[PDB]
RNA sequence: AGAACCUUACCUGGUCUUGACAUCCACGGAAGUUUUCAGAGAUGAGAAUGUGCCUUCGGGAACCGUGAGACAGGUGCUGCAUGGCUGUCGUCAGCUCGUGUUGUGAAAUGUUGGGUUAAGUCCCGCAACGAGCGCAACCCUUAUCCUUUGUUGCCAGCGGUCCGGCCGGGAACUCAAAGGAGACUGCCAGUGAUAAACUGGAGGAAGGUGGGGAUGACGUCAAGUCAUCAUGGCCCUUACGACCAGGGCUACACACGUGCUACAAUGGCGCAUACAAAGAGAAGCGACCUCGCGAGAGCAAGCGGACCUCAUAAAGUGCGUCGUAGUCCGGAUUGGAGUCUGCAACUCGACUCCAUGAAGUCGGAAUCGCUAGUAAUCGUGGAUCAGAAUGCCACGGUGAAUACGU
């Protein structure tokens, strides 16, 4: 099985922002480099919160909220300084942070 | 049982009244809120007037009482007896 | 609720940072298990009496907006009622109603 | 059609991965032997029970990977995962394994733990007064 | 009440022998969700039945379920200041389950030092129509033969049924105008 | 008072969020406070314009404000200096340098919050509100949509009892998860205390204004996506 | 949603009133930082580092002491003065909008009937017509299944080989996150006024809008919060404000609501053994390591979470062991120490462990949820979270009787 060379990770709370922002990033990476892969999807996280629904009392009835956090990896086998440069020049997302750091 | 884990206690808080009281051996009741503090050998023969949230209680400090904190000899709560209810707090 | 319970904390956090930060590890080195047949002398540890309200064990903070005690949520910096109000209005990114 | 036919063994929200091919009757279960995994157990007689019925016990060879479930229960999931895979001895083969219900997926699906409620459906108990 | 006839789930042959009747038994033998014990405790009970007489593992079990079987039931439906009884005819679907429920009630008090035995010994008794629940059918049929005398607010109903192209007598049975 | 709050339930489908930023869990509590402050402090400068929405966004090394208005020029002001002063107090609250851009203006005579400002004047000015509500509803249906619901509260005219009124017309679904549906609840003062109008307005049963991406991975992005998957 | 102290939300005790905290003006100090002693801490006195920022070059802002006014502040009172927001009946299955007509009118009619429906669902239809709300719908999620991606996912054969996808290597495969596919009470058949739909037939994972959720009309109840918060009326403004500590929300007479675990042997004990899903952890949690009776410890690879770790998930599997005797179940109290979180373990914190060692053998009056992935029952993680979970939220293992009949 494969050895991790480098980690590209895109992180968002919003599900629509992370697919689109990836779809441009992968395009930008093929246009400005020669060795790219289709973004491994990687499993989505979901955090559980419960709060009241009335201002005071009515204990029984409750309210539940969820927030998901989505991960894309791309997996460029070598990113060039000119791929990373195009990536940051053609960035336009808000929903997403892209990480070129690893861990 | 419970303890003070691993680090060194005299209480920081009690220390500044005590160091001047030991110099005399014992002097007038040291006005203390520091019920957080334990009893030790240096403290044998002092008189600690120990605030309980409502008022001070004099604890005479002595060798048979070194296994304890100061806060234990001065009470806090009131207990309703049950022949008939408790009228008073007890010191 | 009151502005005083938040005012008390706000003075506590400037003093926490002033005395305790350089002294964080003065506990592990001088007190805990790393202090095996080393120090454990009171005379270097007698200096924490002024930071006594600023201590990490009373940094329970509660809601940031109001000073209202109890029922806090550290991830919003808010509480139950006031979380619900911000989720109701779409103020929080990605936060939606649940179904499964 | 596949190089080795394949079953998903979905039974009660556990999925049994099961690879069938022709051979001499040999078995792999969870990257170990039958004897380690289902030792002095009735669960060894479960996985054989559908394979004996279509009379290929000493004729089908198998490789089995299994996640989720209970030790007795996973043997019970592999019992659907084998019949899922069987599709090509004859064109009628999957029809008949479906007719016996060991292709037919356990359609009942989970109810989420509910908000304001103690269980999926356990609404509170109160007399409170 | 209830707009249409609605069904039931149906239980499916166990994975270790291939019987429904055994898979339906283990289910009311299950206590605190532990189906994986209740299985072995039934087959080892069936193995004990095979030791009293070796001719089948189901020999005494299949007939216990005939011998303690209710054919008739009593339902109850209050008329004012009093409850009374009104008999009803039982469905087969409840006849079997009643009989297996009285077998596991009798089995938990049998007191022998392992349940495979307690269960097998209480089946051994219900195989000859001699065990605990022989009484419990017999008594229920006795309340059902006796308690046909009363019916659900018969006296004002009794003209209302006969006039509606019914019979001239209060029907002591479920879902009739009487 | 029953019902779940109508906008609270749309944020996963066909309504967009009011805010889009990223804090990676640990800093989220500090970011939520900062998004609130940029909302509060920016609106404090524009009291005099008319506005339908506020939308806050944090790109890399950047904070972008989107604002929705009654006409394009009202927030831009004389020689663009007003909108630069707005970008000045977003730079002072936010931890990054600031942009603000103006949105497309859409249904500005029928909008939830501008319709509610409009009713609120009638309550300020202490009229009986005996026929006002019907004339409110009539005008809304001359100006567009397929239905409107109004509920008016606040101790009408300065009364010492509660006295509410309401008005529903046309088709208004209430608990709908499909389409955007425009809602505002106003809070405002006059002499005798606080008043309030709840305004639900209904444009269409499907609106496409927020969707998940169109395509799977293969037709989307880079032309050549396929791996060798081995094959040295 | 985690009350030793903070929770001034409360009380007492120390202590001050332009005021803990903001703007504006007056004066002294830069704020920031380091440090000794008194004082319980607030507070106070002093030392030492720095003199930045603007400048009618006075002096000031920031922040701090002091003062005046404006004013700050108040879980301050009133919820029959309210706004914001939501509970109840109830998923009751009803309720109304536009409009005409009939009565003198309040009001009816429609909204009632026949058939059918999970529902005012839908066919037929009358002076009610047309139409809306709620249930229905769109909706998310899951289920196979088709599809692409191909790792931190996967392995039918092959290599290194302890036969573990760890890695040479491989793509048949689940599988994740996303395009989405299928099912329409449809087709065909019986029935029913083709007329909704129920039942039968079939392929398929599945035929009753597939399982699950979202989901609550118009609205009485003078429902409940001025204590999230808005806010008048309206009260205090050396305080009905505020710093600091100690006490306290977890008291104790008891009774009551709720949940847990036990009362057994279907089990408990011991040694040995197996697979989850989902999620949290770069203030943090963490393998291997060596230490420690165990708890834990220090060391430290690591971990952005499909990688490493909580975690060996438990119930379940193997085998012996125990006999109704409160035991071999249950293990509470309490003596005593070892350890943990913390500048503080006494009333009110967490864990190991030694000795000693009880109630409880299916529980009066009372008392509630459930139609099937449910009821029942086990373990897990997490929000909260300095330190405290039996709770709550969600996940997955194992998983029940029956629904004839009105």
Cross-chain Cβ contact D115/A64 below 8 Å:
yes
The number of distinct structural domains making up chain D is 1
**Structural domain of C82:** 1-90
CA distance E34 to E32: 6
To the question of domain A5-103 being in CATH 3.10.20.440, the answer is: no
Which segments within B12-85 are labelled E, that is strand?
Answer: 30-32, 47-51, 56-60
Tell me if C40 is assigned to some domain: yes
Identify the three-state secondary structure at position C100.
Answer: coil
Cβ atoms of E163 and E99 closer than 8 Å: no
Phi first, then psi: give them for residue B47, nearest 5 degrees: -130, 110
Task: Give me the resolution in angstroms, 1 decimal.
Answer: 12.1
Torsion sign (Cα): C10, C12, C18, C21: negative
Tell me the two tokens of residue E174: 């479920």
The number of distinct structural domains making up chain C is 1
Best B12, B33, B40, B42 member to test C by mutation, with max C CBs in 10 Å, is B12
The one-character DSSP state at F55 is E
Helices (H) and strands (E) in chain F, counts: 4, 9
Phi first, then psi: give them for residue F44, nearest 5 degrees: -65, -35
Distances (CA, A) of F226 to A4, A7, A38, F39: 19, 19, 7, 45
Nucleotides on chain G within 7 angstroms of protein Cβ: 1-9, 11-13, 20-21, 32-43, 73-75, 80-90, 96-98, 117-119, 131-145, 147-157, 163-180, 198-199, 203-207, 210-221, 223-225, 227-232, 241-248, 251-254, 257-259, 265-267, 274-283, 296-299, 303-307, 314-319, 323-324, 336-347, 349-352, 366-378, 381-387, 392-406
The one-character DSSP state at E158 is H
DSSP characters over chain A = --------EEEESSHHHHHHHHHHHHHHHHHS-S--------PPEEEEEEE-SSSS--TTT-EEEEEEEEEE----SS--HHHHHHHHHS---SSEEEE----
Q: In the block, which residue shows the tokens 């629940």?
A: E133
CA distance F186 to F10: 20
Is B66 in CB contact (< 8 Å) with chain C?
no
CA distance E67 to C5: 77
CA distance F123 to F101: 34
Cβ atoms of D11 and D106 closer than 8 Å: yes
**Structural domain of E117:** 20-143
**CB-neighbour burial class of residue F80 (10 A; exposed 0-12, middle 13-18, buried 19+):** exposed
Q: What order do you get walking across the sheet with B47-51 strand by strand? A: B30-32, B47-51, B56-60
Q: Which helix (H) or strand (E) holds D6?
A: strand D6-7
Count CA atoms within 13 Å of residue D4 on its CB side: 14
Cβ atoms of F191 and F158 closer than 8 Å: yes
Phi first, then psi: give them for residue E116, nearest 5 degrees: -55, -40
CA distance F83 to B15: 62
Tell me if F44 is assigned to some domain: yes
CB pairs under 8 A between C and F: 55
Cβ atoms of F101 and F63 closer than 8 Å: no
Same domain, F69 and F113: no
Largest separation between any pair of C-alpha atoms in chain A = 61
Cβ atoms of A61 and D116 closer than 8 Å: yes
Cβ atoms of F151 and F166 closer than 8 Å: yes
According to the 3-state scheme, what is the secondary structure of F176-187?
CCCCCCEEEECC
Same domain, F98 and F130: no
Tell me the two tokens of residue E6: 């609605």
Tally Cβ neighbours within 10 Å of residue F191. Answer: 7
Residue closest to F175 by CA, chosen among F202, F154, F208:
F202
- Measured between its terminal Cα atoms, the distance across chain D in Å is 67
Phi first, then psi: give them for residue A70, nearest 5 degrees: -100, 140
Instruction: Report the DSSP beta bridge partners of residue F148.
Output: F169, F201
CA distance A24 to F220: 9
Q: Which of residues 46-75 of A touch D (CB under 8 A)?
A: 50, 60-64
D85 Cα to chain E: minimum distance (Å): 18
**Structural domain of D120:** 3-129
Largest separation between any pair of C-alpha atoms in chain E = 64
Tell me if C99 is assigned to some domain: no
- Nearest 5 degrees, angle CA A22-CA A24-CA A28? 115
Q: Which residues, other chains included, contact F107 with Cβ-Cβ below 8 Å and sequence gap of 6+?
A: F52, F144, F182, F203
CA F25 to C1' G91 (Å) is 38
**Structural domain of F72:** 16-106
Q: Which helix (H) or strand (E) holds D21?
A: strand D16-22
């Amino acid at each position: 099985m494969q050895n991790q060379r480098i980690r590209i990770r895109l992180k968002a709370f919003d599900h629509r922002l992370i697919d689109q922002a990836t779809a441009e990033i992968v395009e930008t990476a093929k246009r400005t480099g020669a060795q790219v892969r289709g973004p491994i999807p990687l499993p989505t996280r979901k955090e559980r919160f419960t709060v009241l629904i009335s201002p005071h009392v009515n204990k029984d009835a409750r309210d539940q909220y969820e927030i998901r956090t989505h991960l894309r990896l791309v997996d460029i086998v070598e990113p060039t300084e000119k791929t990373v440069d195009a990536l940051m020049r053609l960035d336009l997302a808000a929903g997403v942070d892209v990480q070129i750091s690893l861990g | 049982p419970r303890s003070l884990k691993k680090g060194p206690f005299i209480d920081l808080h009690l220390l500044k009244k005590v160091e001047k009281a030991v110099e005399s051996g014992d002097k007038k009741p040291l006005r203390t809120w520091s019920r957080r503090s334990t009893i030790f050998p240096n403290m044998i023969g002092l008189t600690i007037a120990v605030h309980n949230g409502r008022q001070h209680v004099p604890v005479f400090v002595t060798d048979e009482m070194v296994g304890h904190k100061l806060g234990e000899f001065a009470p806090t709560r009131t207990y309703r007896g049950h022949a008939a209810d408790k009228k008073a707090k007890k010191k | 609720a009151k502005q005083s319970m938040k005012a008390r904390e706000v003075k506590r956090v400037a003093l926490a940072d002033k005395y305790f930060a350089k002294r964080a590890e003065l506990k592990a080195i001088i007190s805990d298990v790393n202090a095996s047949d080393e120090d454990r002398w009171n005379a270097v540890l007698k200096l924490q009496t002024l930071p006594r309200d600023s201590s990490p064990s009373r940094q329970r903070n509660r809601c940031r907006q109001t000073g209202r005690p109890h029922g806090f949520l550290r991830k919003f910096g808010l509480s139950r009622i006031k979380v619900r109000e911000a989720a109701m209005r779409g103020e929080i990114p990605g936060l939606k109603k649940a179904s499964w | 059609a596949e190089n080795q036919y394949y079953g998903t063994g979905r039974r009660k929200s556990s999925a049994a991965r099961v690879f069938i091919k022709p051979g001499n009757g040999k078995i792999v279960i969870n990257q170990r032997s039958l004897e380690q995994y289902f030792g002095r157990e009735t669960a060894r007689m479960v996985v054989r029970q559908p394979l004996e019925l279509v009379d290929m016990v000493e004729k089908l060879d198998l490789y089995i990977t299994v996640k989720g479930g209970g030790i007795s229960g996973q043997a019970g999931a592999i019992r659907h995962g084998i019949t899922r895979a069987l599709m090509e001895y004859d064109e009628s083969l999957r029809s008949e394994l479906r007719k016996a219900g060991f292709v037919t997926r356990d359609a009942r699906q989970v109810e989420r733990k509910k908000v304001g409620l103690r269980k999926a459906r356990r609404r509170p108990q109160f007399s409170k007064r | 009440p209830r707009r249409r006839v609605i069904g039931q789930r149906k239980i499916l042959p166990d994975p270790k022998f291939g019987s429904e009747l055994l898979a339906k038994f283990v289910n009311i033998l299950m206590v605190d969700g532990k189906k994986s014990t209740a299985e072995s405790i039934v087959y080892s009970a069936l193995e004990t039945l095979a030791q009293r007489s070796g001719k089948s593992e189901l020999e005494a079990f299949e007939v216990a379920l005939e011998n303690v079987r209710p054919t008739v039931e009593v339902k109850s439906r209050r008329v004012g200041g009093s409850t009374y009884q009104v008999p009803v005819e039982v469905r087969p679907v409840r006849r079997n389950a009643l009989a297996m429920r009285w077998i596991v009630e009798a089995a938990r008090k049998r007191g022998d030092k392992s349940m495979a035995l307690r269960l097998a010994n209480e089946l051994s008794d219900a195989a000859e129509n001699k065990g605990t629940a022989v009484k419990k059918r017999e008594d229920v049929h006795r309340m059902a033969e006796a308690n046909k005398a009363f019916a659900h607010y018969r006296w004002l109903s009794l003209r209302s049924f006969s006039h509606q192209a019914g019979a001239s007598s209060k029907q002591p049975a479920l879902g009739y105008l009487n | 008072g029953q019902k779940v709050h109508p906008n609270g339930i749309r944020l996963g489908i066909v309504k967009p969020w009011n805010s889009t930023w990223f804090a990676n869990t640990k800093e989220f509590a500090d970011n939520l406070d900062s998004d609130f402050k940029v909302r509060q402090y920016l609106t404090k400068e524009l009291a005099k314009a008319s506005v339908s929405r506020i939308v806050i966004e944090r790109p890399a090394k950047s904070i972008r404000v989107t604002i929705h208005t009654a006409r394009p020029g009202i927030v831009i002001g004389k020689k663009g200096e007003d909108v630069e002063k707005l970008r000045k107090v977003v730079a002072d609250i936010a931890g990054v340098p600031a942009q603000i851009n103006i949105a497309e203006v859409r249904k500005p005579e029928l909008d939830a919050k501008l319709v509610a400002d409009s009713i609120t004047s009638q309550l300020e000015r202490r009229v009986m509100f005996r026929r006002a509500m019907k004339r409110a509803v009539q005008n809304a249906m001359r100006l567009g949509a397929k239905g409107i619901k109004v509920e008016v509260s606040g101790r009408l005219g300065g009364a010492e009892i509660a006295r509410t009124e309401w008005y529903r017309e046309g088709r208004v679904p209430l608990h709908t998860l499909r389409a955007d549906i425009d809602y505002n609840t106003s809070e405002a003062h006059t002499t005798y205390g606080v008043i309030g109008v709840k305004v639900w307005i209904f444009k269409g049963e499907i609106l496409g204004g927020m969707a998940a991406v169109e395509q799977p991975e293969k037709p989307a992005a880079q032309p050549k996506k396929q791996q060798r998957k081995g094959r040295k």
